[PDB]
Amino acid sequence: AQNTISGKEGRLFLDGEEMAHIKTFEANVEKNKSEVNIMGRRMTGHKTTGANGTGTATFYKVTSKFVLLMMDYVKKGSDPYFTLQAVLDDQSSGRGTERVTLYDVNFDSAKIASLDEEEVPFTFEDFDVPEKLSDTF
Amino acid sequence: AQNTISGKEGRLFLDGEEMAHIKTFEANVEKNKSEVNIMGRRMTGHKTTGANGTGTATFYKVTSKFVLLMMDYVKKGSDPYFTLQAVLDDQSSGRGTERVTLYDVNFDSAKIASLDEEEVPFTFEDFDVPEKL
């Protein structure tokens, strides 16, 4: 419901290579079973490496390279783990503006090769808000 | 992916009572396991009572009655099964324009009481395109 999380303009890196300037994206930390407030205490706190969840996001541009890359992946019939590192867009501004990373976000290869709708599903295995941003500006 | 389904202006009935003029809605027949083309042959054909799936939809207006009704439901901690009967919006127009019903669509009570975002989730247990229009 409101246990959501989203951020403006971001980039996802496959083991180091930037591979898509992904725009608006919005995830959802899953609130499952015995765990009071998973999200609350991850943005601000030490907790289980949980923060696993589902989500959706739309890409801005698509590099041929990337597509072809993804193809070689779906060929081997596997889905890779990219790391999506964007800019948080919480308007509440409980603080200011920090970077959000989504460890192990993961889409269906094919679904990506098909990029050339735009809202693609994906499932990160952990989320994070490590640093603030453009200090003093 | 494209195994989607959606329809313009619709209405969901709880055992006979209309309870929300739900606008745009968009479901997703789940393609699971041993089952070639589930959807394809349900719109046009006899098949398993499957066509179970997940989806999303946004409501147009919300009757206080309904909200309060839903509240009495979440009270008893249960989620009721509504029948969403809308008008199909397939632009391809393989035929024309038919009604689409979503047997046993079901949202989270609370989620609905909270109506007074708008895209609410729900999980029908079967879909259908019975008549034209």
Side-chain angles (χ1 to χ4, degrees):
Chain A
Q2 205 61 67
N3 195 185
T4 187
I5 172 184
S6 92
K8 263 266 201 172
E9 308 223 0
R11 287 76 207 189
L12 79 173
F13 306 54
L14 198 165
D15 208 331
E17 284 145 56
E18 208 190 54
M19 307 214 70
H21 291 188
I22 176 139
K23 239 62 168 178
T24 173
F25 94 82
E26 180 190 66
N28 275 294
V29 276
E30 174 203 71
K31 165 199 179 183
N32 228 54
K33 306 161 187 181
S34 54
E35 203 83 296
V36 62
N37 185 180
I38 313 180
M39 176 164 96
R41 46 184 190 55
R42 185 43 192 282
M43 309 206 225
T44 157
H46 169 200
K47 86 172 196 189
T48 187
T49 311
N52 59 66
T54 307
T56 147
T58 38
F59 297 70
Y60 151 56
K61 53 163 60 176
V62 189
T63 154
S64 295
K65 304 162 181 169
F66 187 49
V67 210
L68 167 54
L69 186 281
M70 290 311 299
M71 200 69 88
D72 251 65
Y73 258 126
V74 54
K75 297 178 175 183
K76 77 189 74 169
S78 256
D79 283 320
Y81 283 142
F82 334 56
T83 284
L84 186 168
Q85 197 171 177
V87 167
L88 195 48
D89 66 21
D90 198 316
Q91 185 46 276
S92 180
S93 184
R95 287 118 83 178
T97 294
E98 316 121 290
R99 180 127 92 186
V100 194
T101 84
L102 279 308
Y103 305 146
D104 267 41
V105 0
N106 165 25
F107 334 75
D108 179 57
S109 310
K111 274 158 50 182
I112 314 176
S114 165
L115 275 50
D116 191 62
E117 288 193 290
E118 302 210 304
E119 288 186 67
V120 196
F122 73 71
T123 72
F124 61 107
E125 251 52 276
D126 187 320
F127 101 92
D128 194 316
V129 182
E131 54 202 302
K132 277 201 167 177
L133 225 292
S134 204
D135 319 301
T136 321
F137 194 47
Chain B
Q2 206 60 69
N3 195 188
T4 185
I5 172 182
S6 101
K8 261 272 198 173
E9 305 225 355
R11 284 81 205 185
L12 78 173
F13 307 53
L14 199 173
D15 208 330
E17 285 143 56
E18 208 187 53
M19 314 213 56
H21 290 188
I22 178 141
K23 239 58 170 182
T24 169
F25 92 85
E26 183 189 65
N28 273 292
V29 272
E30 174 203 67
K31 167 197 174 187
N32 230 53
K33 306 163 184 181
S34 50
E35 203 84 295
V36 62
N37 186 182
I38 312 176
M39 176 167 92
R41 44 178 190 59
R42 185 46 193 278
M43 311 206 228
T44 159
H46 169 198
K47 88 171 196 196
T48 185
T49 315
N52 65 63
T54 307
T56 144
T58 44
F59 297 71
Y60 149 56
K61 58 161 59 174
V62 190
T63 153
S64 293
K65 307 165 187 164
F66 187 49
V67 210
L68 168 56
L69 186 287
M70 283 316 285
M71 204 72 91
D72 250 67
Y73 256 122
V74 58
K75 294 179 180 183
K76 77 188 74 172
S78 256
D79 285 316
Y81 287 134
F82 331 62
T83 284
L84 186 166
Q85 198 169 175
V87 164
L88 197 46
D89 65 17
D90 198 320
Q91 185 46 275
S92 184
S93 184
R95 290 117 83 178
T97 293
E98 313 120 289
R99 184 126 87 182
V100 193
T101 81
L102 281 307
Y103 308 143
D104 267 35
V105 1
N106 163 23
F107 331 76
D108 184 56
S109 301
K111 272 160 46 188
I112 319 173
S114 159
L115 274 50
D116 192 64
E117 291 191 286
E118 304 209 302
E119 283 184 69
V120 194
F122 74 71
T123 70
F124 60 105
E125 248 50 278
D126 187 315
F127 100 95
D128 193 318
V129 181
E131 56 201 295
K132 280 202 169 176
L133 229 289

